[PDB]
Amino acid sequence: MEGFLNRKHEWEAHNKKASSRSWHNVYCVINNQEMGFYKDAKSAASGIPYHSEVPVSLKEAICEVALDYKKKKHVFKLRLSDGNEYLFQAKDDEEMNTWIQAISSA
Amino acid sequence: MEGFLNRKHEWEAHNKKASSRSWHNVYCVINNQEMGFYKDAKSAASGIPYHSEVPVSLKEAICEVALDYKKKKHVFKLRLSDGNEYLFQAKDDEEMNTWIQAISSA
Numbered sequence: 001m002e003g004f005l006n007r008k009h010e011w012e013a014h015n016k017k018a019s020s021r022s023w024h025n026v027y028c029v030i031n032n033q034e035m036g037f038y039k040d041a042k043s044a045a046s047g048i049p050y051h052s053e054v055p056v057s058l059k060e061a062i063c064e065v066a067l068d069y070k071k072k073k074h075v076f077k078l079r080l081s082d083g084n085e086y087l088f089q090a091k092d093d094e095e096m097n098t099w100i101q102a103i104s105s106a
Numbered sequence: 107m108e109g110f111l112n113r114k115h116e117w118e119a120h121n122k123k124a125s126s127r128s129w130h131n132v133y134c135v136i137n138n139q140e141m142g143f144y145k146d147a148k149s150a151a152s153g154i155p156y157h158s159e160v161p162v163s164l165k166e167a168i169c170e171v172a173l174d175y176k177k178k179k180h181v182f183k184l185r186l187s188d189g190n191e192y193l194f195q196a197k198d199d200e201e202m203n204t205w206i207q208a209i210s211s212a
């Protein structure tokens with residue numbers, strides 16, 4: 001499963017607020033129980049990472065609709081096992097749910 | 107880049123005709139200069155291989171429209187560097203070309 005998604009890094013480990021918190025349009029790929037980030041589809045096929053980011057494991061990840069986040073629509077929350085938390089924005093709700101199911105079933 | 111494609115194993119290394127030559131509907135994923143095969147999208151996210159197949163490298167691969175193959179339409183040919191050759195069938199020509207560009211640019 002892959003596609004573009006607006007992403008925001010919210011939390012880091014140990015209840016620390018992430019220092020880098022602006023939204024960025026990234027091309028996401030769910031494969032082999034992990035999620036990789038690329039600038040676009042072409043970088044994804046070539047294996048060139050978003051910002052030297054390493055793919056993250058979706059093992060025991062918590063993924064759900066971000067009701068609490070109100071600054072925008074179709075936003076879902078992803079908390080990785082290591083404590084990092086991201087907010088992802090999809091084009092509409094159907095896609096949002098498509099992503100939530102994909103991740104929750106990895 | 108990923109999606110379902112009908113696949114046929116044509117050639118093996120050393121100008122040997124592949125022994126296993128029936129068409130099979132497989133879910134293909136182009137990521138990090140390689141191509142993985144899965145039974146479906148869900149197996150792809152989970153990392154469960156098509157038939158214990160290992161992803162193949164697209165490094166120096168030859169990919170083109172299979173003019174010579176006439177038994178069906180929208181079929182492209184992929185020759186890997188190690189000698190293996192596969193024929194892939196897409197739903198239409200646009201998608202076929204989409205796949206040919208994706209692979210040729212990996």
Ligand SMILES: O=P(O)(O)O[C@@H]1[C@H](O)[C@H](O)[C@@H](OP(=O)(O)O)[C@H](OP(=O)(O)O)[C@H]1O
Nearest residue numbers: 008009010019020021022023069071072087
């Ligand atoms: O450009 P900067 O320095 O990174 O600033 C951030 C940016 O404007 C984010 O869009 C904003 O998130 P929200 O849009 O979601 O408000 C975040 O606020 P935040 O502190 O609420 O996280 C800002 O700190």
Ligand SMILES: O=P(O)(O)O[C@@H]1[C@H](O)[C@H](O)[C@@H](OP(=O)(O)O)[C@H](OP(=O)(O)O)[C@H]1O
Nearest residue numbers: 114115116125126127128129175177178193
């Ligand atoms: O079921 P089997 O034993 O695997 O038989 C093959 C199967 O019917 C393939 O569809 C056919 O390819 P084509 O459809 O493309 O004709 C192939 O012929 P082939 O020898 O031409 O490769 C057969 O050998």
